[PDB]
Amino acid sequence: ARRGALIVLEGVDRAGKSTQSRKLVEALCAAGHRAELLRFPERSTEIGKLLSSYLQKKSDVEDHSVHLLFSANRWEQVPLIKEKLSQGVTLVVDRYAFSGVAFTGAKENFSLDWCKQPDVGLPKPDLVLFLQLQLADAAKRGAFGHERYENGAFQERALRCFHQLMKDTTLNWKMVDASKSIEAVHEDIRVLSEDAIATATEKPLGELWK
Amino acid sequence: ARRGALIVLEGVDRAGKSTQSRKLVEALCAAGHRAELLRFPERSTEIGKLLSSYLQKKSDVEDHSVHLLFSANRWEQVPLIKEKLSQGVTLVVDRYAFSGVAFTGAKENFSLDWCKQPDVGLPKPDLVLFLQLQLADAAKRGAFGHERYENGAFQERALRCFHQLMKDTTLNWKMVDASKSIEAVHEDIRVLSEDAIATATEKPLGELWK
Numbered sequence: 001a002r003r004g005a006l007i008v009l010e011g012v013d014r015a016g017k018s019t020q021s022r023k024l025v026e027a028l029c030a031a032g033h034r035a036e037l038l039r040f041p042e043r044s045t046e047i048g049k050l051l052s053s054y055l056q057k058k059s060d061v062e063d064h065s066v067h068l069l070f071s072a073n074r075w076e077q078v079p080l081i082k083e084k085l086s087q088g089v090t091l092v093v094d095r096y097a098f099s100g101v102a103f104t105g106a107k108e109n110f111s112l113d114w115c116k117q118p119d120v121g122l123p124k125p126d127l128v129l130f131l132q133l134q135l136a137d138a139a140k141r142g143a144f145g146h147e148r149y150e151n152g153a154f155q156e157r158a159l160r161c162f163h164q165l166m167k168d169t170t171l172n173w174k175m176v177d178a179s180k181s182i183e184a185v186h187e188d189i190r191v192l193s194e195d196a197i198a199t200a201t202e203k204p205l206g207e208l209w210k
Numbered sequence: 211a212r213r214g215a216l217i218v219l220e221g222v223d224r225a226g227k228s229t230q231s232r233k234l235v236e237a238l239c240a241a242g243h244r245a246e247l248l249r250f251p252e253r254s255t256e257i258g259k260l261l262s263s264y265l266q267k268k269s270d271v272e273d274h275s276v277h278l279l280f281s282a283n284r285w286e287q288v289p290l291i292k293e294k295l296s297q298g299v300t301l302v303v304d305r306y307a308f309s310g311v312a313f314t315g316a317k318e319n320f321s322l323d324w325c326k327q328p329d330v331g332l333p334k335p336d337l338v339l340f341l342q343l344q345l346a347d348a349a350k351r352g353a354f355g356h357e358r359y360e361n362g363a364f365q366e367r368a369l370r371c372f373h374q375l376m377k378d379t380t381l382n383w384k385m386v387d388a389s390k391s392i393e394a395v396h397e398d399i400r401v402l403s404e405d406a407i408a409t410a411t412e413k414p415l416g417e418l419w420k
């Protein structure tokens with residue numbers, strides 16, 4: 001019985017990850033697929049609540065601890081992810097382990113190797129879309145929030161980390177020109193996604209970074 | 211200004227870790243040292259509360275997630291640990307990263323390498339005491355609780371993992387014959403501890419597993 005695809009959307013802030021993740025699930029379902037949306041962090045769980053308070057600057061959390069909470073927040077959803085994929089449901093995920101590594105890896109004294117480890121073994125995405133946008137016109141997309149990491153210097157360091165992760169050819173990375181209209185970007189993403197659902201799925205679900 | 215020593219007590223269950231950790235701090239303070247007690251998990255924090263509920267079987271937690279919460283529970287205390295040691299306070303710690311690895315490593319499909327990673331970089335103990343006791347007479351020490359992991363089969367697997375970690379000569383492991391009286395075991399531990407406080411401290415605090 002045909003498994004669903006695990007599709008992740010990544011990108012710096014204001015690239016369009018959440019808008020395109022919502023539109024993608026809508027379109028896939030309208031075209032007869034079974035598809036559902038997930039996002040990380042998943043702020044509804046106990047761990048998710050700690051992460052939400054940290055990101056809102058309502059609480060401070062030691063940098064290594066918070067990194068591990070972001071990873072645990074993904075692991076607590078692994079039984080659900082595997083169940084849905086095995087049932088033939090494609091999952092569209094707004095941020096995943098790559099944001100986990102890029103954001104902590106932007107802090108001083110955090111190696112990419114250490115940042116990756118907690119997430120080693122997670123379900124491996126069949127397609128990782130990276131929504132590219134000059135940090136500049138991304139900045140044309142309204143302005144910064146009061147949330148953690150919402151500043152230019154930090155975003156640039158995270159962006160450097162994302163390009164280090166893209167050197168990883170064990171992963172099906174696809175660059176998306178997120179500077180176009182919402183509808184144009186959506187169509188690029190939708191076509192890539194239909195190909196992965198069909199093809200990428202002929203092989204068993206993989207394990208990330210192993 | 212002379213730093214304090216980081217002393218950890220490890221062992222299977224009912225070996226005497228908590229009794230000897232309390233007696234050690236008492237004795238050191240009576241002999242003029244500045245020493246304080248710590249334990250892991252530290253159940254008072256938000257993460258600690260999640261761990262306490264899991265161990266009491268009041269809640270179920272995905273195995274990878276709970277492993278990462280145990281590690282984050284140590285990291286959230288690192289600023290305090292470093293501050294106390296730099297102030298000349300010796301810290302006696304009832305369980306540490308070694309229990310973290312041995313307990314998750316006893317579960318199926320968990321490699322010691324993956325289990326170790328989250329804790330790579332923690333403050334490195336200057337002395338790791340391992341309280342040895344036949345799992346048998348340990349069993350003479352009353353009986354099992356209703357808490358998680360409190361069964362013979364699981365304890366044996368954890369014990370095998372502890373012996374794998376002892377092959378690590380980057381660490382100052384000392385075996386303690388925990389089958390003797392509380393006072394006799396205490397005296398062995400106290401003498402080893404005084405030596406580490408004096409000597410082990412001439413070098414800067416190290417980083418675990420790196």
Ligand SMILES: Nc1ncnc2c1ncn2[C@@H]1O[C@H](COP(=O)(O)OP(=O)(O)NP(=O)(O)O)[C@@H](O)[C@H]1O
Binds near residue numbers: 012017020180
């Ligand atoms: N292609 C686009 N052109 C112009 N504006 C866009 C485009 N895509 C999204 N936006 C707008 O830009 C803002 C950010 O979009 P959103 O999809 O929330 O980004 P995001 O990548 O999830 N940001 P964040 O979660 O903060 O990193 C919203 O007001 C969107 O309406």
Ligand SMILES: Nc1ncnc2c1ncn2[C@@H]1O[C@H](COP(=O)(O)OP(=O)(O)NP(=O)(O)O)[C@@H](O)[C@H]1O
Binds near residue numbers: 223
């Ligand atoms: N040397 C000893 N001889 C006999 N009983 C002992 C000895 N040391 C401790 N005990 C008793 O054995 C029980 C377990 O001691 P305790 O110090 O709490 O062990 P622990 O190693 O912290 N156990 P756990 O935390 O469950 O792995 C207590 O009732 C102690 O009084």
Ligand SMILES: Cc1cn([C@H]2C[C@H](O)[C@@H](COP(=O)(O)O)O2)c(=O)[nH]c1=O
Binds near residue numbers: 041103
């Ligand atoms: C998933 C994830 C996100 N992040 C960040 C990126 C964003 O600042 C934030 C999520 O913001 P959002 O929930 O408003 O989209 O958390 C991490 O630092 N680590 C992670 O593992």
Ligand SMILES: Cc1cn([C@H]2C[C@H](O)[C@@H](COP(=O)(O)O)O2)c(=O)[nH]c1=O
Binds near residue numbers: 250251265305313359
């Ligand atoms: C510190 C630590 C303990 N443990 C276990 C060993 C014990 O079962 C338990 C602590 O029990 P206790 O708080 O009653 O001493 O948690 C882990 O599994 N991982 C860890 O990182």
Ligand SMILES: [Mg+2]
Binds near residue numbers: 018019
């Ligand atoms: Mg978003």
Ligand SMILES: [Mg+2]
Binds near residue numbers: 227228229
């Ligand atoms: Mg104890």
Ligand SMILES: [Mg+2]
């Ligand atoms: Mg490694």
